[PDB]
């Protein structure tokens, strides 16, 4: 992965991210590793080694991103999972979450600043005093570290949950091998370049938000816009706004999101939109109905 983000911020393109109609914020490629440097300078600070396992909760798509390379180039392996809907009391996440912490030899957690506060709670709930947090958004205020760690082909990369799992979560072991396996192959039966623009919404936990588009878009160096999940469900129609202002021709969302939209049929019958920019809509197969994609 190492060879990856190096290449990436060999282009002008990058990273876009969305606060709201009329704000955004710029992370070029080269911005990135600069960026990735100073998050691991405060990672090794923590106590890290390579190799060992660490843990995401993340809401703002900045803090996550940096975190996910400032790991790649310190050589850990960080576990890619949702943030809980609310820490204060036990519940199905955080059942979940207490298995997985308790899996991963109780790992670090890596956060925000506006979560740091909600998962520190986790302490008295869980009754284990060997849990520990960490803010990202402080981190990019620390020097860089350009001693990369040595990394090798089949190398553990990244921990995925199956979040979507009625019983107790499983993790997945992925190596920078098995990962760039498919980023080859799925450039090439789909066509992206340097070129394309690619929206995404879907949170960074699920296996869309990695490996099909993020990783894909810095493998290619295509420029890159990431928007909130809360703000799209929060009102379907930003979904077209975004396509408009970005003229973007890589988007994807499961069939969930399509008929959301439908549900507007009065507002898109008044006042238009550009989406010829559009060139590839991806959406997950395990929900696939027809009817409400000719609608």
């Known amino acids: 992965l190492q060879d990856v983000l190096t290449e990436a911020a060999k282009t002008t393109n990058g990273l ?12 070029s490629y080269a911005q990135l590793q600069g960026d990735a440097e100073r998050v691991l300078t405060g990672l090794r600070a923590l106590g890290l080694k390579a190799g060992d396992p660490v843990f995401f909760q993340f809401s703002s798509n900045h803090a996550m991103v940096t975190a996910f390379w400032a790991c790649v180039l310190g050589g850990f392996v960080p576990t890619l999972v949702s943030a809980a809907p609310t820490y204060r009391e036990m519940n199905a996440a955080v059942k979940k979450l207490h298995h997985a912490w308790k899996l991963l030899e109780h790992p670090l957690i890596l956060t925000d600043d506006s979560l740091i ?7 008295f709930l869980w009754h284990t005093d060997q849990l520990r947090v960490a803010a990202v958004e402080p981190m990019l205020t620390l020097e860089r570290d350009t001693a990369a760690h040595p990394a090798a082909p089949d190398d553990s990369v990244f921990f995925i949950l199956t979040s979507g799992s009625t019983g107790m979560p499983k993790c997945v072991e992925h190596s920078h091998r098995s990962v760039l396996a498919n980023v080859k192959g799925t450039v090439a039966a789909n066509q992206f370049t340097q070129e394309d623009v690619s929206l995404d919404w879907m949170p960074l936990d699920h296996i869309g938000g990695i490996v099909m588009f993020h990783l894909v878009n810095v493998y ?11 703000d799209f469900i929060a009102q379907p129609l930003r979904w077209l706004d975004w396509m408009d202002r970005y003229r973007a021709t890589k988007t994807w969302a499961p069939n969930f999101a399509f008929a959301m939209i439908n549900d507007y049929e009065k507002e898109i019958s008044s006042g238009s939109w550009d989406l010829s920019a559009m060139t590839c809509m991806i959406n997950g197969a395990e929900a696939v109905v027809p009817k409400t994609i000719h609608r």
């Not at 506060?117 to 986790?122: D, K, N, T």
């Not at 290619?220 to 809360?230: K, M, P």
């Open 16 to 27: 876009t991210y969305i606060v709201n109609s009329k704000n955004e914020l710029t992370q």
């Open 117 to 123: 506060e909600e998962v520190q709670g986790l302490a």
């Open 220 to 230: 290619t160096g295509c420029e890159q816009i990431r928007a909130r999940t809360d």
